[PDB]
Subunit: 114 residues, 3 copies
């Protein structure tokens, strides 16, 4: 799995250890080894949400499997709470897009996962 | 919905008010409330389009519904027009990827929209 | 086609000519003219792969067709070889997501490809 967070919160406000934290939380939540987990955090972005520039975030979670109705509900509870706790972003100014990737459309190590 | 513009135009060329303007235009074209519209502009990027580094942009528009054959042409006409008029990017150096998102794959405020 | 590379490799380590090389190699592998290829490279990112901050990359290739299990394996071999030679990123620290786009979902030049 790969998790991207794009946010207008400044780089100084991202807690040292945030990426390692997310890695760990995503391993437990998706039941996937931390070895295949990639996390990418992009602060200081020029963005608006509802027309304003208060703290917001636009996130994507791509995974091979483990995506769907119930699971995405669980992920949204977990991830909005982590962004609210550590970045101080209201949960109503977060969007998370979930992508179920086919294993043939994920390249890794010079091949794909199918 | 969410609209992301990645461009090699410098930050000082983005006009004051541009994200607010995009927010209102997208509210009117999609017919969704402005409250659920997020806009993200990424200037100063390192990019080429057709093998050259003239001004260009790579954009994405993600919405739950209101995405389709005819609608995507109207969005393209509106958005390439605004990019050309505001950022001075020619319409033939703009790509816009359109995504119809299922409500169960969009997380917001700790739940999904399903 | 459009190819995006996000990486934690510093900007100074991306060699002059890399975007043109990527254009040329994409055009040959996919058979699309260089005119419709856009390349976007984003260095200096805050990202972890497998929980560590060694050199890594998260890439996406979007194309209207020419995406498939066997084609994707060939793209992966070429692209990871290019990343490895030019940016010194190990191939097991690269993910590449592949997207086959419908023509109606790609805007270009004030309209769509449909």
């Amino acid at each position: 799995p790969m998790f991207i967070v794009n946010t207008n919160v400044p780089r100084a406000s991202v807690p040292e250890g945030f990426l390692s934290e997310l890695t760990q939380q995503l391993a437990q939540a998706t039941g996937k080894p931390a070895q295949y987990i990639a996390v990418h955090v992009v602060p200081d972005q020029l963005m608006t949400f509802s027309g304003t520039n208060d703290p917001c975030a636009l996130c994507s979670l791509h995974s091979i499997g483990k995506i769907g109705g119930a699971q995405n509900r669980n992920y949204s509870k977990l991830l909005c709470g982590l962004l609210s706790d550590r970045l101080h972003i209201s949960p109503d100014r977060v969007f998370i897009n979930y992508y179920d990737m086919n294993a043939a459309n994920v390249g890794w190590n010079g091949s794909t996962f199918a």
